Amino acid sequence: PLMVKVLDAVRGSPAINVAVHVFRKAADDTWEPFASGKTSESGELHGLTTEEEFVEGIYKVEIDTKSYWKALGISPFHEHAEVVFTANDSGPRRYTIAALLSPYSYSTTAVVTN
Amino acid sequence: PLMVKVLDAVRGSPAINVAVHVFRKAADDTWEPFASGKTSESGELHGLTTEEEFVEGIYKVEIDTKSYWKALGISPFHEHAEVVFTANDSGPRRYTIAALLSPYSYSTTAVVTN
Amino acid sequence: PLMVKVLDAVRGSPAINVAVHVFRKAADDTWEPFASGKTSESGELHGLTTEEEFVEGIYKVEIDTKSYWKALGISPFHEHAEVVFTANRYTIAALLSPYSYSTTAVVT
Amino acid sequence: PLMVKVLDAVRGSPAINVAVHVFRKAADDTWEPFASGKTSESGELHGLTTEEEFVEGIYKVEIDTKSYWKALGISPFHEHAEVVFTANRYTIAALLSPYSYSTTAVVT
Ligand SMILES: Nc1[nH]nc2nccc(-c3ccccc3)c12
Ligand SMILES: Nc1[nH]nc2nccc(-c3ccccc3)c12
Ligand SMILES: [Ca+2]
Ligand SMILES: [Ca+2]
Ligand SMILES: [Ca+2]
Ligand SMILES: [Ca+2]
């Protein structure tokens, strides 16, 4: 139910080995850790969660763009890229968060399917 | 060797049934038709060409964004989105042209693999 | 030293009357208020800070994109758009759609 | 009536000294030269045309992104970036990376 895909606009490639941390807002309004992983050789991250565990909530997907660029020996601008959204409010959906990265820029979109 | 993927930034969905026309620059510097198709329910267009037919050249991928929006009953800004590139100059590659559409904006990236 | 500019990819316009709050990260890893305002008719927010106030540090720009889309009658995906960067003249530009946003930095 | 603005997503800067040629589509479906210039230090190209010259029609903005990247020593993917639209004040903005570009229209 939750997938992340990341592309690199400088190299013309998937963005491989990008760390992604997902948080869920708790009852007390703090962010609680929900899941994490890293993108594969295709720039995709599957397996973050399950239909059972991906309940309604406000979720934050934090893509570690900084470490990605630094590993390439590049000094990037942003600390991270985050996507924060309310999930499953009108019933279960599947969410793909797609991101396109450059050292001084990022773009994200969501693909939501029923 | 050539795939096109299109997403819709307004609906949060694949951009389905988008016409895509591919041209190749001929010897006389004119654009010649090379291949065409339309995106599927996943927003993807496979099958445009083959390894045999996708020789070196300068290619134009013209994504019919205008008809896409008009079909949704929306009046868009651009006539189309085009990506023009030299292909296969240092040997065969696989190319994915990924696009993200809004009525007054588009973004494209290339994923090139060996 | 810091300018925010917001554009609307649906309407092909500046994103006007967008609330923007800027925070600086404190030593305890909490976020100190720093600047705020609403984008103008040109989608720009100028006058956030001065050179003497704007010291090196990690800054967060929180753009209230949800209220923007709802005031236009459009259901938005995101709760907000928050842009976090280290300062080491900065323009933070954002291009908004209901299910997507893009941001770039122009540092001159 | 027509302005072009170009930004560089790699360097976090305006894209300076970018050649831009504007064409208007003729009745025979060929392309008549209309305006051209190079982006300034702010990445902007102003003064392309006047109100009386800028009539309704289909316009093509051809941005020489390949020469831009090569002058910086960077191998680019695209031959150029060409933006085609009907005019029915227009800013055509483009954000460049070596393998990607994004463009939006701001019509006010
Ligand atoms: N997330 C993104 N922000 N900007 C983009 N520009 C082009 C493509 C993607 C994208 C990724 C995967 C498939 C299709 C599109 C973009
Ligand atoms: N043309 C564009 N494509 N993608 C973009 N992403 C962020 C910002 C801009 C942009 C440019 C000028 C002002 C405000 C926004 C972008
Ligand atoms: Ca509910
Ligand atoms: Ca060759
Ligand atoms: Ca320092
Ligand atoms: Ca008319």
**Domain residue limits, chain C:** 1-108
Q: Which residue has the tokens 């890293």?
A: A38
Residues in chain B: 114
Q: Select the residue of A77, A80, A82 nearest C105 (Cβ to Cβ).
A: A77
B105 in contact with chain C, both atoms CB, cutoff 8 A: yes
Find the radius of gyration of the CA atoms of chain A: 14
Residue C5, ligand 2, Cβ within 6 A: yes
Question: Among B65, C107, A24, A87, which Cα is nearest to D103's?
Answer: B65
Q: Is the CB of D13 under 6 A from ligand 2?
A: no
Number of helices (H) and strands (E) in chain A: give both, helices first: 1, 9
Residue D49 near residue D33 (C-beta atoms within 8 A): no
- Choose among C6, C98, D93, A53: nearest CA to B74: C98
Q: Which of B55, B34, A102 is nearest to D8 (CA)?
A: A102
Fold of B1-114: Immunoglobulin-like (2.60.40)
A44 assigned to a ligand binding site: yes
Taking the centre of ligand 2 as the mean of its atom positions, its distance from the CA of residue C94, in whole angstroms, is 6
Resolution value (Å, 1 decimal)? 1.2
Residue B104 and residue D99: Cβ atoms within 8 Å?
A: no
- DSSP letter for each residue of B77-98: SBS-EEEEEEESBTB--EEEEE
CA distances from A93 to A49, A113, B6 (A): 13, 6, 20
User: What is the Cα–Cα distance from C64 to C18, expressed in whole angstroms?
Assistant: 6
Provide the token pair at D74: 């960077």
Chain A 54-83, CB below 8 Å of chain D: which residues? 77
* C52: CB partners within 8 A, 6+ apart: none
Give the pairing type, strands A19-25 and A31-38: antiparallel
Alpha helices (H) in chain D, listed in sequence order: 65-71
Task: Please give the distance, rounded to the nearest whole angstrom, from the Cα atom of residue A16 to the centre of ligand 5.
Answer: 29
Residue of A nearest to B95 (CA): A12
Residue A54 in tokens? 């991906």
Q: Tell me how crowded residue D49 is: count the other CB atoms within 10 A of its CB.
A: 16
As beta bridge partners, residue B24 has B32, B59
- Domain D1-108: give its CATH architecture: Sandwich (2.60)
Amino acid at C108: T
Give the integer Cα–Cα distance in Å for B92 and B108.
Answer: 21
Nearest in space to B29 (alpha carbons), one of B74, B5, B72, B60: B60
Sign of the dihedral through C-alpha A55, A56, A57, A60: positive
Q: How far is CA B22 from the centre of its chain?
A: 7
Report how far residue C80's alpha carbon sits from residue A3's, in angstroms, rounded to the nearest whole number.
Answer: 20
Q: Counting ligands in written order, which one lies closest to the CA of residue C44?
A: 2
Structure determination technique employed: X-ray
Rounded to an integer, what distance in angstroms lies between the CA atom of residue A38 and that of residue A20?
6
In this structure, what token pair is assigned to residue A53?
């565990």
Contact status, residue A48 vs residue A73, Cβ threshold 8 Å: no
